[PDB]
Amino acid sequence: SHMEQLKCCSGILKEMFAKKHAAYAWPFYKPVDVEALGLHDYCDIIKHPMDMSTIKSKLEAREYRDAQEFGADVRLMFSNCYKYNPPDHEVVAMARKLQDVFEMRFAKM
C-alpha cells in the first residue's frame, strides 16, 4: 500500500522541481546555507532544517515508511521558513505559493 503512495510522493516532488514553479520554488531546492547567507541565529531557531533535495534523497534511499512521513518533511520545510522569517518577507510569500502546489496534489493522492 505504502509503495504506491510513495511513487505518487516522488511525482509531487518532481512537479515542485518543475520550471513552471521555479520563480517561487528555487529557495527550497537545497539546504539553507547559513554561511553564504550570514544567518548566525538560524541553527538556534531552526532545530530540524529541511529542503527539497534532502526529501528527494530520502525517497531515493526508501527512507520514508509512508506518504504521511513525506508530507511531514514537506510541511517542516515550509514551517521553518514561516518560523524564521517575519510574515511580510518575500521568501514567506514564495513558500505559500509552493505549499499551495504541494497541498493540492497531496490531498488528491
Name residues whose C-beta falls within 8 Å of residue 96's C-beta, 6 or more positions apart in sequence. Answer: 78
- Taking CB under 6 A as the criterion, the residue among 28, 64, 70, 78 binding ligand 0S6 is 28
Residue 4 near ligand 0S6 by CB under 6 A: no
* Under rule CB under 6 A, residue 37 binds ligand 0S6: yes
Q: Count the residues in the chain.
A: 109
Half-sphere exposure of 75 (CA within 13 A, CB side): 8
- Out of 8, 17, 27, 66, name the contact with ligand 0S6 by CB under 6 A: 27
| 90 interacts with ligand 0S6 by CB under 6 A | yes
Q: Which of 23-45 are b and which e, b meaning 16 or more Cβ less than 10 Å from the residue's Cβ?
A: ebbeebeeebeeeeeeeeeeeee
For the bound state, the minimum distance from the C-beta of residue 62 to ligand 0S6, rounded and expressed in Å, comes to: 26
Q: Site residues (CB under 6 A) for ligand 0S6? A: 27-28, 32, 37, 39, 81, 84-85, 90-91, 94
